[PDB]
Structure formats: C-alpha cells, structure tokens
C-alpha cells in the first residue's frame, strides 16, 4: 500500500515508462503516483501478462515492461520491490 | 484472487 500522501506525489515518467503509459491511452507527461499505478495495472491486464491460475505472477521477459523493470518476472505481492522498480523509472517533481 | 485485487492491494 502506497501512503495517502505518497499517492498524490507528482512525477514525470522517464521515456520507456512514458511509452508504456501512452500505449494504454495516457496522454500527459506529468502524473500522480496513483495515476501511474492505475495505468500500469491496466497495461498488465491489457497485455494478459498475469498467470491465469496464480494471478499474482507477472511474466515480462518478452515485453516492454521487462525492459523497464529489468526483470523477467515478478510477484505483485513484492510491494517494496515493485515501488523500487517504478521509482527508478520516473523523476519526482522538484526532487 | 484476481490480478485486479492483488494490484489494488499494491496500490
């Protein structure tokens, strides 16, 4: 769970993440962390990258998502790991 | 569980 205050943090995705977000219809350069997480979840569902049987497993070795996270797969249960991977791919506004 | 629910818990 991202804290309520952290959800409204304004961020500028780096180019690969921005490309991912725009492929599912995002249309700006600046987002809240909450918005980034909405579009990422949507992306994973649109590309059907989750295991249908154990739906916390995401496979991304042959996908853009694997290129920007730098991993071949991950578990949605790894909250810290995911936040770390996402933060590597954006600049926090004014930081 | 659904991917939707796991991701919503992450969010």
Numbering used by the authors:
A (entry chain A): 18 to 112
B (entry chain C): 17 to 27
Extract from the study:
In common with all reported high-affinity binders, these peptides incorporate a signature p53-derived interacting motif comprising F, W and L residues that respectively dock into discrete hydrophobic pockets in the N-terminal domain of Mdm2. The Mdm2 and Mdm4 N-terminal domains that bind p53 share considerable structural homology, and there is significant interest in the clinical development of potent small molecule and peptidic dual inhibitors. The p53-degrading function of Mdm2 is enhanced by the structurally related paralog Mdm4 (also known as MdmX).
Towards reconciling this functional disparity, we have solved the structure of M011 bound to Mdm2 (residues 6–125). The crystal structure of M011 bound to Mdm2-M62A shows 2 unique complexes in the asymmetric unit. Within each, a single molecule of M011 interacts with a pronounced hydrophobic cleft that binds endogenous p53 (residues 19 to 26). As with other peptide antagonists, an interfacing signature triad of F19, W23 (6-chloro) and L26 residues (numbering based on p53 sequence) project their side chains into discrete apolar sub-pockets (“Phe”, “Trp” and “Leu” pockets). The structure highlights ready accommodation of the 6-chlorotryptophan chlorine atom by the hydrophobic pocket. Comparison with the structure of a similar stapled peptide (M06), comprising native tryptophan bound to the same Mdm2 construct shows remarkable similarity. Each M011 complex, from the asymmetric unit, shows high structural similarity to the corresponding complex bound to M06 (all-atom derived RMSDs = 0.167 and 0.126 Å). The major difference arises from rotation around the CHI1 bond of the L57 side chain in Mdm2 to widen the Trp pocket, with other residues comprising this pocket (F86, F91, I99) remaining unchanged. This optimal formation of Van der Waals contacts around the 6-chloro moiety, resulting from the change in conformation of L59, explains the ~8-fold increased binding affinity of M011 over the parental stapled peptide lacking the 6-chloro modification (PM2). Structural differences are also observed in the lid/hinge region between the two M011: Mdm2 complexes in the asymmetric unit.
